[PDB]
Ligand binder design. Structure first.
Ligand SMILES: Nc1ncnc2c1ncn2[C@@H]1O[C@H](COP(=O)(O)OP(=O)(O)O)[C@@H](O)[C@H]1O
Ligand SMILES: Nc1ncnc2c1ncn2[C@@H]1O[C@H](COP(=O)(O)OP(=O)(O)O)[C@@H](O)[C@H]1O
Ligand SMILES: Nc1ncnc2c1ncn2[C@@H]1O[C@H](COP(=O)(O)OP(=O)(O)O)[C@@H](O)[C@H]1O
Ligand SMILES: Nc1ncnc2c1ncn2[C@@H]1O[C@H](COP(=O)(O)O)[C@@H](O)[C@H]1O
Lengths: 237, 236
């Protein structure tokens, strides 16, 4: 039956385009094949990456919606596009680390794979020109990016999302190492928004440690799309 | 009578820690060594150690009298103080009342930016890693501390900020930011280390004159004068 009409492009980011629609409070999120890392210094076109990321995001957000998480996700429209509630993004990346990896393990002198003694929650300030710096709750409130009570709600939702995702991935022999979330305001409510995909998570096979995510691109490991396909195929088991 | 200084336990960038003939006491000896930028910048600043020992001693005596549990027992001489020997928790606990220095630089703010809330932050005390900014979850997650210990540290830190902000404001100094360290001692958390113009930013509340180690860091000149000014004001 009736479908939204895609109107003007509102924004093009590193990996997606956001389009207006004929509904003032809805956008279409379009997944590109662009891959980027290292403050824009590293790029590639990874054929079909956007299709896989749209498909994985859609599957995960449908699952989160069913678990009662309030999210922007309405429906997948085609191989690359999904219909979402238009949100005013809170300018914080919310990162969960179950295991220490990447730059974070590096900055603290930890072996990659270090088992953290408590689940890590952290914030990066969403400003690519400042390099998306790590900040704490007081910095975030102090510069007017958020309030204590907004952060409290964000953390509650984030912790629930981690419990749900850790378990869904564990069932399929995937360790959910870390991931990044974004939230936004819609109808005065705090919604989970953006993407949850191998671009925004670290996924290691639980037996071999094999990486099935964007680190295969960041570290020139090859078979990038095969790792993303494997994540989707396991999620669809 | 007087405790006896025995072997050196540790030489840091600014102070030496000496053992004493009491197993639960150390002597903290203030050098004239100045350092900045991950050890890359160094100088000797004549009498800096004396002024920092004098300022630290004055401040810790005040905090002791206000009921803060600290390591400080007594000043011994121009450079030395007698302190309880603590097991330092490996965190630099930084308070920022106004954004300046590294916070201002990394968040693209002007120094002097007014904050909507007092900032409490941690750096991991590991000079080989450059004392990186970390959050509470990182600190607990790597085994540096526990949530219960951090909670206590922050409660003491907030109290110390209130006392120091007021003592400095009475002398027309804005306490812009500062760094504390804490240690474990006989089951408790004590304020330890130093509170001086090496570990605080002090701006005159009217003119903005900087009276702290930024004068050394930024080659501003008249460095020791600034330290003398802070001590003289504290002694009004
Ligand atoms: N539901 C939404 N409404 C409006 N903006 C969104 C929504 N979900 C995500 N965004 C924003 O859209 C952009 C998605 O594209 P992306 O390529 O990830 O951009 P960026 O390069 O800015 O990180 C991001 O800026 C993201 O914060
Ligand atoms: N700006 C961003 N856009 C998308 N995903 C991100 C971003 N920042 C962090 N992440 C995700 O958050 C997790 C932690 O990233 P991090 O370790 O901080 O980056 P790196 O180690 O690659 O420097 C990873 O899964 C990463 O994919
Ligand atoms: N009461 C105390 N007992 C034991 N160690 C202490 C005490 N107070 C401070 N310290 C430690 O003594 C050293 C003081 O000298 P400093 O030059 O500041 O060293 P650093 O270069 O390690 O920062 C620091 O490592 C500090 O943590
Ligand atoms: N390793 C350190 N030693 C002494 N003082 C410090 C240290 N790190 C931060 N400070 C103090 O903490 C405040 C914030 O410093 P910065 O992070 O450089 O802006 C300033 O008053 C510094 O002098």
């Amino acid at each position: 039956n009736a479908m939204v009409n895609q109107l003007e492009m509102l924004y093009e980011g590193k990996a997606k385009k956001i389009y207006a629609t004929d509904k003032e409070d809805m956008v279409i999120v379009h997944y590109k094949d662009d891959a980027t890392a290292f403050n824009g210094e590293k790029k590639a076109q990874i054929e079909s990456k956007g299709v896989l990321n749209n498909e994985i995001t859609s599957l995960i957000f449908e699952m989160l919606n069913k678990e009662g998480i309030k999210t922007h996700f309405v429906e997948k429209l085609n191989d690359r596009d999904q219909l979402c509630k238009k949100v005013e993004i809170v300018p914080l990346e919310v990162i969960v680390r179950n295991v220490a990896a990447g730059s974070m393990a590096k900055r603290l002198g930890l072996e990659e794979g270090y088992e953290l003694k408590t689940t890590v929650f952290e914030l990066s300030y969403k400003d690519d020109s400042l390099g998306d710096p790590l900040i704490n709750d007081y910095h975030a409130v102090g510069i007017g990016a958020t309030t204590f009570e907004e952060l409290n709600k964000i953390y509650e939702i984030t912790a629930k999302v981690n419990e749900i995702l850790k378990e869904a991935f564990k069932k399929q022999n995937i360790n959910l190492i870390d991931f990044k979330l974004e939230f936004g305001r819609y109808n005065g409510e705090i919604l989970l928004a953006d993407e949850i995909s191998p671009d925004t998570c670290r996924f290691w096979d639980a037996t071999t440690g094999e990486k099935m995510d964007k680190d295969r691109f960041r570290r020139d490991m090859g078979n990038v799309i095969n790792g993303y396909r494997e994540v989707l195929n396991r999620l669809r088991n």
